[PDB]
Amino acid sequence: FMVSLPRMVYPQPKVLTPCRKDVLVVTPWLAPIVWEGTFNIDILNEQFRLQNTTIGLTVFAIKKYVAFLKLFLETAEKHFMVGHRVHYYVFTDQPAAVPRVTLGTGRQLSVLEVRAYKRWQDVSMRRMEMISCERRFLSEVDYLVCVDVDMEFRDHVGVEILTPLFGTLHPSFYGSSREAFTYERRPQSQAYIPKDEGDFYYMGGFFGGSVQEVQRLTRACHQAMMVDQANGIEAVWHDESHLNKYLLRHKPTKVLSPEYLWDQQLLGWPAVLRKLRFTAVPKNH
Ligand SMILES: O=c1ccn([C@@H]2O[C@H](COP(=O)(O)OP(=O)(O)O)[C@@H](O)[C@H]2O)c(=O)[nH]1
Ligand SMILES: OC[C@H]1O[C@@H](O)[C@H](O)[C@@H](O)[C@H]1O
Ligand SMILES: [Mn+2]
């Protein structure tokens, strides 16, 4: 049950003027595409705080990638869901290497020890299995957001993203035609997508939703990866290829624009991006 919003004074939405004319702001299945200009964060904050929303954030930091946690967590404290309840879940092979970062009120961090795989591909792929921590998340958070750790927040990432299921437009492909997308193209893989299919190319480094929908997604991607392994095939972009297949066949209820996962060194700051909110930290692969 949702109580009434309080009185609020803000600019009237004008029906005969779009918030953004340069970009697509709603998918053909009526899911908002979240860009700056399209939302009033004060209305959204009221709606979500009145539900006492708790957001879980998962991040994996295996092997050398523990070095990214300090900046990731400190910048998450300045920009990710401030004002709301947040539970960080740090999955790592080295619990003693997790930095002690100071958290704001209503925010907590859990360290979850996992095994390290040798190949960076298996580390990245096995997050789907590891996420699908099932009973624990249902009890502790309302939404789960799953991200890469080699990143920093530079601007607001808030409750405008929350919805039953979302993916994020990959920053290298948002202007690309679908035949250029790097989907898995071999019909022998479960992740296969033909050249005449595909809405968007979603980034493996930032997806989320309600706990139920995220567990559906991660279970389905982990089962599809197991089928490929048993067939001796590994998708071209690993868990990202499987997430793309899943989101083609289960449309997300919101799509985040590339504001939400950007790489300034590789792609600069185009005018269609008013804000760069969560951005790659340069590293040597
Ligand atoms: O040795 C590794 C390799 C991968 N990762 C995790 O898997 C994510 C995806 O891998 P990566 O960021 O290397 O992929 P890229 O963004 O460079 O394509 C990393 O952000 C970490 O969260 C990790 O922790 N340790
Ligand atoms: O083609 C897809 C690839 O695009 C890269 O630009 C990104 O660094 C990889 O992680 C994978 O997403
Ligand atoms: Mn990454």
From Swiss-Prot:
Q: Which residues lie on this side of the membrane: Lumenal?
A: 3-285
Q: What does the note accompanying the cofactor annotation read?
A: Binds 1 Mn(2+) ion per subunit.
| Glycosylation sites (chain numbering) | N52
Which tissues carry this protein? Answer: Expressed at high levels in testis. Also expressed in pancreas, uterus and lung and salivary gland.
Output one GO MF annotation: antigen binding
Consequence of mutating K283M? In allele Bw08
Q: Provide the record's note on post-translational modification.
A: The soluble form derives from the membrane form by proteolytic processing.
Record key words, sorted: Blood group antigen, Glycoprotein, Glycosyltransferase, Golgi apparatus, Manganese, Membrane, Metal-binding, Secreted, Signal-anchor, Transferase, Transmembrane, Transmembrane helix
State the reactions this protein catalyses: an alpha-L-fucosyl-(1->2)-beta-D-galactosyl derivative + UDP-N-acetyl-alpha-D-galactosamine = an N-acetyl-alpha-D-galactosaminyl-(1->3)-[alpha-L-fucosyl-(1->2)]-beta-D-galactosyl derivative + UDP + H(+); an alpha-L-fucosyl-(1->2)-beta-D-galactosyl derivative + UDP-alpha-D-galactose = an alpha-D-galactosyl-(1->3)-[alpha-L-fucosyl-(1->2)]-beta-D-galactosyl derivative + UDP + H(+)
Bilayer topology term? Single-pass type II membrane protein
Q: Out of the domains of life, which is the source?
A: Eukaryota
Which residues of the sequence carry a binding annotation for UDP-N-acetyl-alpha-D-galactosamine?
Answer: F60, A61, I62, Y65, D148, V149, D150
**Which residues catalyse the reaction?**
E240
Q: What is its EC number?
A: 2.4.1.40, 2.4.1.37
The record lists the lineage as:
Eukaryota, Metazoa, Chordata, Craniata, Vertebrata
User: Pathway, per Swiss-Prot/TrEMBL?
Assistant: Protein modification; protein glycosylation
UniProt-recorded name of the protein: Histo-blood group ABO system transferase
Give the source species: Homo sapiens
Similarity remark: Belongs to the glycosyltransferase 6 family.
What outcome follows a substitution of G205A? In allele Bw08
For activity, the cofactor(s) needed are: Mn(2+)
Q: Which residues bind Mn(2+)?
A: D148, D150
What GO terms fall under cellular component here? extracellular region; Golgi apparatus; Golgi cisterna membrane; Golgi membrane; vesicle
What does the record's free text say on domains?
The conserved DXD motif is involved in cofactor binding. The manganese ion interacts with the beta-phosphate group of UDP and may also have a role in catalysis.
The compartments listed are: Golgi apparatus, Golgi stack membrane; Secreted
Q: Where does an alpha-L-fucosyl-(1->2)-beta-D-galactosyl derivative bind?
A: H170, T182, E240, D263
Q: Tell me where the signal peptide lies.
A: none
Q: Explain what the record says happens when changing G167R.
A: In group B transferase; lower-level protein expression and intracellular cytoplasmic mislocation
Q: Which gene encodes it?
A: ABO
